[PDB]
Each structure stands twice: as structure tokens, then as C-alpha cells.
Amino acid sequence: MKVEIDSFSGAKIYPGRGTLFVRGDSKIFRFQNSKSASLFKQRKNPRRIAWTVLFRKHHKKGITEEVAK
Amino acid sequence: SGNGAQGTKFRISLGLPVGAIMNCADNSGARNLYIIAVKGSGSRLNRLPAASLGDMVMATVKKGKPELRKKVMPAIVVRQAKSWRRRDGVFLYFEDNAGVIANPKGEMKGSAITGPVGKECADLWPRVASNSGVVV
Amino acid sequence: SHRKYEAPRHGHLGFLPRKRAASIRARVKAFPKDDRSKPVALTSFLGYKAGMTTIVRDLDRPGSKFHKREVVEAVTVVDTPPVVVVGVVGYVETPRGLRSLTTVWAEHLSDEVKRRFYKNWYKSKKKAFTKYSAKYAQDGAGIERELARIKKYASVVRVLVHTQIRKTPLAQKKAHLAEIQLNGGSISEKVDWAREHFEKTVAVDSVFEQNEMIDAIAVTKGHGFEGVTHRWGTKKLPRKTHRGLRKVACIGAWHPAHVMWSVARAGQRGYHSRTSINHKIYRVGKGDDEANGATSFDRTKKTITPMGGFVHYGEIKNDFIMVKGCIPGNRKRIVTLRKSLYTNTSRKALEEVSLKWIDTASKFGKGRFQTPAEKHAFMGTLKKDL
Amino acid sequence: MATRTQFENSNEIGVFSKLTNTYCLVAVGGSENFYSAFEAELGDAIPIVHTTIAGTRIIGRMTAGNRRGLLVPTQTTDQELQHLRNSLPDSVKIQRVEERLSALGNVICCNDYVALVHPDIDRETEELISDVLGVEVFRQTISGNILVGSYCSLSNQGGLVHPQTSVQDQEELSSLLQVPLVAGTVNRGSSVVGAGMVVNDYLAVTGLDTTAPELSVIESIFRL
RNA sequence: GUGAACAGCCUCUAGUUGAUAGAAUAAUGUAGAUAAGGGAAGUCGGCAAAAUAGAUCCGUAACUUCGGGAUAAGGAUUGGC
RNA sequence: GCAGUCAAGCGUUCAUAGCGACAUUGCUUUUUGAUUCUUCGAUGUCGGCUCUUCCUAUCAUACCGAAGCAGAAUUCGGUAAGCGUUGGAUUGUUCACCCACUAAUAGGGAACGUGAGCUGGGUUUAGACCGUCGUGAGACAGGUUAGUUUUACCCUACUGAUGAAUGUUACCGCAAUAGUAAUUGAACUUAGUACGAGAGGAACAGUUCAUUCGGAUAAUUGGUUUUUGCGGCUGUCUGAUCA
């Protein structure tokens, strides 16, 4: 059992949890829940939903000591 | 299953009843396939015999290069676009339906396959995996 | 005229009537066959269902596709307080069936057992087991004569037990008394084993074991009065039908001139007694066993309690049985765990495989975190605390 | 030599097996009869390895490599990666490849000296294949087919191509590959030659349905 | 007031607050609804529901009694400062 | 419609492997007839959808016997209905003919089962059109289009529920009786073995799955979402903001 990362939010997915979708480009996509899965279907840029991980990474949101080596 | 389908397949969700239209996945010149029946079905009043990933069915070409029409010809399902559960614990699905032309012996009339192919189909049918492209 | 097209019958005939159970606890109709060669041990057992959880284990089945590959399965953890014996009872054989001719009770029964006999506890004087329990003041010939009788007669012996209702995190405040037959040897030895097990624990270290096939007796969750479509599975009538599309069109032919008992009719649904056979145990844990959810591979620190506890159930701090698959009966209800009546040989049982990972995520929503440590680690500091 | 063997009932031996000059892989679901032919002549010369790449038994199409490397797709489990590392000798170095283009066996048609890749290969993967395999790679497709690995069964002593390949196409590769290529069929008329059967420097295994003179051709071209 | 509008929707003047009530709110109903994948395979018959459906720009065939068909068919935009 | 007996002959050679002329004995009440007994102060008339049970002259599955049964396939028969007998184009269709799956798509009864279960497609009032007949009003199993189908608040039967009386009350059990459930197929091995100069070609045992049915639940995926729980947007009204 390895660690797989959500494709839209970035939260860790436990076995038996989440969904999985394959696009026409044959590139993989994993969603932790219908909240993240349906949000992807609406073609939402995930850099703009506040509670995702890519949003907080972009705006150094709560980075604290992670910005320091 | 069916004749020539060596090995066994674990049951998955049925999402292709009689009368479905499936995109042509292989370079046989066809554009779509119209499922008329499935192999190894059951017998229940008012139940459409449905298909699934890796299953082999016969489907006419309602829209394609001419002499592939007006006749029945078997095919193999390579995409389902319907959420099915694997044993490993994943609920996955594809973007759209897709099938490949294949005579009853199990080999393919076409040469190549465009788009992802479910490994539940590659494993069950060796010749499909022989001419398959992306594998999940 | 015939049925035109012939279809399989809707529903089952042997599970009728689909009426309410006579008691909230499904009685054990039969017990595993006895052999007078083995040490004394219990045959059935009592527990409370708490919910389900998800597992991962390495499947070991030669010849299958998923050999030496990980899978996931559902398991229903059942709460288990240690069961204490408060009495024994002998069953004799008659040309009309087994009959109980005597009973023996323990010395100091807990308030739970006394509470069972009273419909109104507060108004009562707690005067139960007062005249009878005084018989121990003498040398004991009052009770020792009865235990002599169960040795001579009563070739079948069933021991009376009850659970601890206060140890379980449930608020019924009243125990569940029940009879449990024994699979020991010699009726003389069976009662002898009973004498020195009054007012003491009987854990799950002897009744069941890891990777054992057991039955599950419980009571169906109730859904009240139901129609005929969802009760049986009858086809829904077409949309154009007048005055109802959720019923059975033709009850019966002109003759016979009465409704057949085999016709499906609206009635009571749920609250049945269903015995599900051949259930396999994966975990047998103890309350004092810290990090129950940890496995030889995880090496983590967490119990089996999910985030926020089991829905409509407590926190679980005592013994438990973690059985593969679903189970009859709903949450907060007594569940009877009983030893398999037949020795299973299918190459599906006897698969002594340990688990690999246990789901402890929240069961009150979309459980995203297994332990508070990893929850606080992933998000980090919040506005609360520092 | 040339051995006639059926996996269960299918004649696609190359699909279910990968044969190289120092190691060989077979499906675990096979029977003694399929296993007997492989161990009949190999003996203890090179190890026999039982694996399931990608959780499936099409390892021949899901895996491709030579003396200097082995290729496994991303989704394969590390437990099987560890198993192949322990079973196979240390002389071969296994590095995972990140690519959703296709199964590696279909994409990669390589040998000790030369390699053939899928039309949609990317430069980042191009360097990874060359360094891992220690093999110079060139761009070309068998008869224009994208599945170069499934329509070309190749070894250091020769090579098989698509049966209906034009004569001009066949000779063009032979100059670069430095080995002759002969158009032909396998398994009683099947045009899938790259996946129908496999060749190493001392053996070639085909299906039991191969006719009389294709097996003779296989012996001639591959110098058995 | 929004709005093409005596359309729908909310309000000012004016007038009612009236047509048995209380509690849980089982089936089966009457009236509204929503359904993963396929999709008329259902049925005598897509009957019922569904989709487009306002406005601006582009574009529009067979045929004809040359007046029409024709907002045919088919495409692109619509908020706020 | 179904089942026998005799038996000339067919069956290379041989009456009964399988068939079988000329005659002849019966069975069936799902054909159609004939009768007219019940009912014209009236028992709602075709078909389709839904559902239950029963019978077998067994279509498939279980176990066997016979062959002009070497294997495979087939054909004939015995105990047997326990279980399963489908999805569609045309037609209102009973019927029928095709497409396809399947182990198989066997026949039937129960007021030609089933309208206070449904539909009203057809035949069957009244409107109207065409053809033939009639001088005419009108007639035709003719062809076609449009044509309101009502009530259970009773008793029994069935499906679920309560309940007095056998000193009271409570707990734990026995058991008569009644019902009963499982079902079929595919892939590998056996095994290019047995069997035959050749095409072909299995089976018992074992493993992995699946078809139909049944009972239970809800971790997981999906659905519903008056927790209006949260966020967003439109029109209007609280002077504006907030709400």
C-alpha cells in the first residue's frame, strides 16, 4: 500500500476511498471524494479554490517553517 | 467470457444493455457500434442482456464505411465509462464507451487501437492486448 | 391459460411469515454437535454490534488471479464485554423432546441480572434473589443436592450467562440473560466446570479464535409496515395504470376462490431473526491491548475506535470480535456469535492470513484522517490552541 | 532451437512471456506443460522467473528489455519490483519508467544493439531508455503501424517484420539494424509476429499452431 | 419596480387574515420533484415528462400559386464596475 | 392432437438400431364441430402488461439403458417437474415468420386464470370517407379515421398487529405442527492422452470465476438531499450597511 495524492485537492487517499477517472489523453486522475470529483467536472481551476493544497502552496498560505530550510 | 476467452473475469458493473452505441476504438473504418446481444447472458423476463469491460458482443455498424453495414459482426469491449469496483478497492471509469472489431475466434480485424484500454480486457483477451495501446 | 412467459418466484417461501420477532434477541434454535472427548468450552456467545470498517489484507489463494496481491474487505466489529456466569441448568431427554427439570443460580448476582426480573426497578424493593440466596448459610446441602441431580440425570447441560451492560458504552443499564450449551466431555465434568466459574469472567480468549468460521444470529433491522413492491421485489406497474403502480396486479386466478398464502401481500417488514452462516473472524482484540488498530506492518499507535466514535454507539474500550463481511442485525443490538455446526473444508476457509491495515477514519462523514496525530500534522496549526 | 508450446490454449507465447539472453519471465498461471518446454533446454543456464506485471499475466507486452535493463510500468507494485530484483541477477539494472504512451513491450522493440520506439515517444523518455538499456535508439515504424513492438519479433541474429510490409521498407531498417529482416507470418496466418513469439540468441518459442515452413523460416533467419 | 408588455414576481391605498382543529406525521394514494450507465431496447402507438425556447450578430435548402417555406436547418454572445 | 398391437417391406446384406404400408384398439377436452341443459329483472366480450399455483404426453439440467454408439456429435427409451424455459423487428393480434443469446428457448389448465388489477390497440352504438349492391332509405367477416369504461366505508380469504379468561407477575427454554432453496454454465489441468492409417476427439477427480434466485445489511462507490447545513445569483420590500 503506497501513498497516492488527490489530483484536484492533493489530500492523501486511503485504500477503499475515493474515485478514479481516465481522460482521453490517457493521463490518470484520482479524486478523494465527490466534492473534489464533481468540482473537477465543472472545469474549475484548482489554483482558485481556497481549501485545496495547490492554493495554499501558491499563496504561501500557512507556510510557517516550511519556507525555511 | 465465451468460446476462446481463456481464463476467467471477475464480475463488474453492467453498463451496456442491448441497444447501446459505442465508439469505434480500432482502425477498422467504422465509427460506432450498435450492441444487439451479449455472450453468456441470463434469462429473465424484461431484462436487457448487458455488457461490460472485456466482454465480447456482436454489434452492427450503424455509421461507417459501407460494406461493414447491414450485417452482424462480433466485437470486444475496451472501455465502459461506468463506475466498476476492482478487487483492490478502486471505483474507476472511463470517459466514453469504446469497442473493437473481432471475429469469434478472438483476433482483431483492425491493426491498432486508439485511447486507453482496460487491463481487464487485455488480460482476458490475449489478442486485444497484442494490438492494444494504453493499458489503463 | 398458462402464464404465457414463466419467471422465477419473487421471494422465499421458507422465511415466512415475515412478522416481527417474538423477542429483541434471536434465540439459538440449535447448537453444535457435542463430543465427550474435548476440554470444556462454550459454544455460543453474546456481543453488541458497533458498525463496520474497511481493511486491507494480502489475499492467499493459489490458482486465483489476485494471489499475493492486496484486496479490501468490509468487516463488522462487534462489541464484547466479558460474559459472567450466574447459573447452570440441566436438560433431560424425553419421548417428547429435551426438557429442563432443574436450575441452579450463583451466589452474588449483579444488579443487572436483578434488574432483568423487574419491569419497574425504581418502585421495586430489590427483593429478588433474597429468599433463595439465603440457602448458602447452611453446609450447602440445599444446592449440593441439586448439582448431584444434574450429574445423574440431564444428559444435556446448558449454562446461564449474562453480559456486562455497564462496561459497554451503551445506555440500556440492563443485562441480557441467555442460555449457552457446552461442548465439553461428561455431564459430571460440565457442571463441575460450572461451579468454579460463577461470578467470574469468560473472555473471548477461549470461546473463539483467529481465522475461525462462525455463525451470526441477530435480529433484522425494522422498517415497519411495507407494501408489496419493496417487500418482495415485484415489478413496478406501468405509468399509465389507474389507482396505483406499486402493487401486485393479479393476486390469483378465479379458482381457487380464496387468496393463496403464496401470493405476495403488503405487511410488516424488518424485525426478523436471520441466521447468517459461515462468517470468518479476522481480529480478536482485548480492551487492555493498546493500539488495536495497529498491525505488524503499520507499527502505528491507534485503537479500532474511529474519529468521533461509532455512529450511534460508544467508544469501545473492551474486548471485540472483528468478523469478515456484513452481519445480520443493526447497531446497538445484541448479536449472538455461535460456533460453526459443521467442519468447513472449502479451501476458502482455513486461510490463516493476518490483516495489513485497518480503517480508523471518521465514520460520521468523509473520513479523511486515521488518527488525530496525522490530522494535526497534515493541516498544522489552527486558530485554536497556540 | 524452435519449440511448439501453447499457454493454456492460446498460441500467443510472446504475449505471455519475455525471453532474453540472460533472463526470462513467464506468467504464474501457467501449467506444467507450458513450463516444461521452457525448462526443457534452458536448464540452469539462466533463471526462470514467475511474475505478474501490472497485476496481469501479459508481462510479455507490459515489459521489454535487454542485458542492461528491465522496464516496468508505473502502476506496478514495489513488492513485485522487489521480487524481480531478488529473483533476477544483479547484472541487470531495473529502473521504473514513467510513461502513459502504451505498454512498454508494444512501445519498445529493442535488442542488445538497436531499439525501436512508438511514434509518440518524448525526448525525456528517449534519454531514459538509452541510458537504462545502453542501446542507441532510432525512429521508425513497422509498415507505418504505431505498435512497433507487437509487429516485429527481433533478436541479435535477425528479425521478423509485418508480413505485408513493402519491400522498400524492409531493406531500409536492415541497414540501420545491421541484421536482415524477413516478412512472414506466425501461428497459422496470424500477422502479429512481434507478440506472437519471441527469440533469444539460443532459442525461439512459437505457438503449437505454427505451420511446417514458417518454423523453418524462423530457424533460418534467427540462425538456430 | 424588474420587465416589450393590462405577462409572471414583490410592494404602497383599500380589504381580508375566511372557508373544523391537535399529534405522530405506516403502507397505498393525489399533486410537485430528483435520479449513476445505456437510451425508446417499453408501449397498439416516445402517450406523460424531457430538452431548445428571451434578446443581439452570422447563416438558411427542397419546392412553390414567386406572395412564402423561414424565428427553416445550423452557429457566436448575454453579469458587474 | 396423442398412444399401442399386427406386419408386407425400407434400412447394402437384417421385421422391429431407426422407420414402416394395408388394416385395427384406445386416450385426451388446450382445436373445431354438434347439442342447447344453466343464465337475456342483465355472472363485463379479444388481446397485451403483472402475479401465484397446478399437470405432464421432459425442451435443458440429475442418474441410467439401446444403436447400423470406435471418439465427438446424434438418435430411441426409463424414474423423474425439484429447478430453469429469454431479449427484439412486423402485426391489436391468438397465431405466424425472422434476428440473437442461451443448457433450453416444451406443451398446457385454473369461468378459452387474471378489467371494483391496468390499457383500450381490435371487434361492437352513435360522426365521416372509398369500393360493390339497391331506383331509393340503406346493406357488406369489406378497407380507414375519431370515439365518457364507475363504487369496497361490508363478510370471508390472504398479508401484518393487539388481546380477556386457566392465583398474580417476571425471566430463561422444549416441542407437535406448518413452510423450506438453491440453480446452471464457462476457462485451466486431465489432454493433441484414451479412441481410428485421417479428419477430428473427450470423460471422472481438482482449481478459478460466472448465470438465475434468496436473505441480510451500508464501511466503501453511486443516488436522493426541508440537516434550507453552507456558499453564490435574480426580482421586489425593510432609508443605506449589516442582517
UniProtKB/Swiss-Prot annotation, chain A:
It comes from the Eukaryota. GO terms for cellular component: cytosol; cytosolic large ribosomal subunit. The keyword Nucleotidyltransferase does not apply. The modification Phosphoserine is found at residue 7. One of its GO terms (biological process) is translational elongation. Present with 247000 molecules/cell in log phase SD medium. There are 2 genes for eL24 in yeast. Belongs to the eukaryotic ribosomal protein eL24 family. This is Large ribosomal subunit protein eL24A. It comes from Saccharomyces cerevisiae (strain ATCC 204508 / S288c). The gene is RPL24A.
Curated annotation (Swiss-Prot), chain B:
Keywords: Acetylation, Cytoplasm, Methylation, Ribonucleoprotein, Ribosomal protein. This is Large ribosomal subunit protein uL14A. Belongs to the universal ribosomal protein uL14 family. It comes from Saccharomyces cerevisiae (strain ATCC 204508 / S288c). GO terms for biological process: cytoplasmic translation. PANTHER family: 50S/60S RIBOSOMAL PROTEIN L14/L23 (PTHR11761), LARGE RIBOSOMAL SUBUNIT PROTEIN UL14 (PTHR11761:SF8). Its main location: cytoplasm. PROSITE patterns: RIBOSOMAL_L14. Methylated by RKM1 at 2 different sites, but it is unclear which are the 2 methylated residues among Lys-39, Lys-105 and/or Lys-109. Component of the large ribosomal subunit (LSU). Mature yeast ribosomes consist of a small (40S) and a large (60S) subunit. The 40S small subunit contains 1 molecule of ribosomal RNA (18S rRNA) and 33 different proteins (encoded by 57 genes). The large 60S subunit contains 3 rRNA molecules (25S, 5.8S and 5S rRNA) and 46 different proteins (encoded by 81 genes). Pfam families: Ribosomal_L14 (PF00238). The keyword Cytoplasm applies. GO terms for cellular component: cytosol; cytosolic large ribosomal subunit. Disulfide bonds: none annotated. GO terms for molecular function: large ribosomal subunit rRNA binding; structural constituent of ribosome. InterPro entries: Ribosomal_uL14, Ribosomal_uL14_CS, Ribosomal_uL14_sf. The modification N6,N6-dimethyllysine is found at residues 105, 109. SMART domains: Ribosomal_L14.
From Swiss-Prot, chain C:
One of its GO terms (molecular function) is structural constituent of ribosome. GO terms for cellular component: cytoplasm; cytosol; cytosolic large ribosomal subunit. Changing residue 242 to A: Cells accumulate 35S and 23S pre-rRNA precursors. Cells display defects in translation elongation resulting in decreased translational accuracy. Component of the ribosome, a large ribonucleoprotein complex responsible for the synthesis of proteins in the cell. The small ribosomal subunit (SSU) binds messenger RNAs (mRNAs) and translates the encoded message by selecting cognate aminoacyl-transfer RNA (tRNA) molecules. The large subunit (LSU) contains the ribosomal catalytic site termed the peptidyl transferase center (PTC), which catalyzes the formation of peptide bonds, thereby polymerizing the amino acids delivered by tRNAs into a polypeptide chain. The lineage of its organism: Eukaryota, Fungi, Dikarya, Ascomycota, Saccharomycotina. Its main location: cytoplasm. One of its GO terms (biological process) is rRNA processing. There is a cross-link at residues 38, 135 (Glycyl lysine isopeptide (Lys-Gly) (interchain with G-Cter in ubiquitin)). The keyword Hydrolase does not apply. Present with 450 molecules/cell in log phase SD medium. It comes from the Eukaryota. Belongs to the universal ribosomal protein uL3 family. The keyword Secreted does not apply. Disruption phenotype: A mutant confers resistance to trichodermin, a trichotecene toxin produced by plant-pathogenic fungi. This is Large ribosomal subunit protein uL3. PROSITE patterns: RIBOSOMAL_L3 (PS00474). It is found in: Cytoplasm. Keywords: Cytoplasm, Isopeptide bond, Methylation, Phosphoprotein, Ribonucleoprotein, Ribosomal protein, Ubl conjugation. The modification Phosphoserine is found at residues 23, 155, 296. The modification Phosphothreonine is found at residue 102. The modification Pros-methylhistidine is found at residue 242.
From Swiss-Prot, chain D:
Phosphorylation at Ser-174 and Ser-175 promotes nuclear export. Coiled coil: none annotated. InterPro entries: eIF6 (IPR002769). Keywords: Cytoplasm, Initiation factor, Nucleus, Phosphoprotein, Protein biosynthesis, Ribosome biogenesis. The modification Phosphoserine is found at residues 174-175. It comes from the Eukaryota. GO terms for molecular function: ribosomal large subunit binding; translation initiation factor activity. The keyword Cytoplasm applies. One of its GO terms (cellular component) is nucleus. Belongs to the eIF-6 family. HAMAP family: eIF_6. Binds to the 60S ribosomal subunit and prevents its association with the 40S ribosomal subunit to form the 80S initiation complex in the cytoplasm. Is also involved in ribosome biogenesis. Associates with pre-60S subunits in the nucleus and is involved in its nuclear export. Cytoplasmic release of TIF6 from 60S subunits and nuclear relocalization is promoted by the GTPase RIA1/EFL1 and by SDO1. Also required for pre-rRNA processing. This is Eukaryotic translation initiation factor 6. It comes from Saccharomyces cerevisiae (strain ATCC 204508 / S288c) (Baker's yeast).
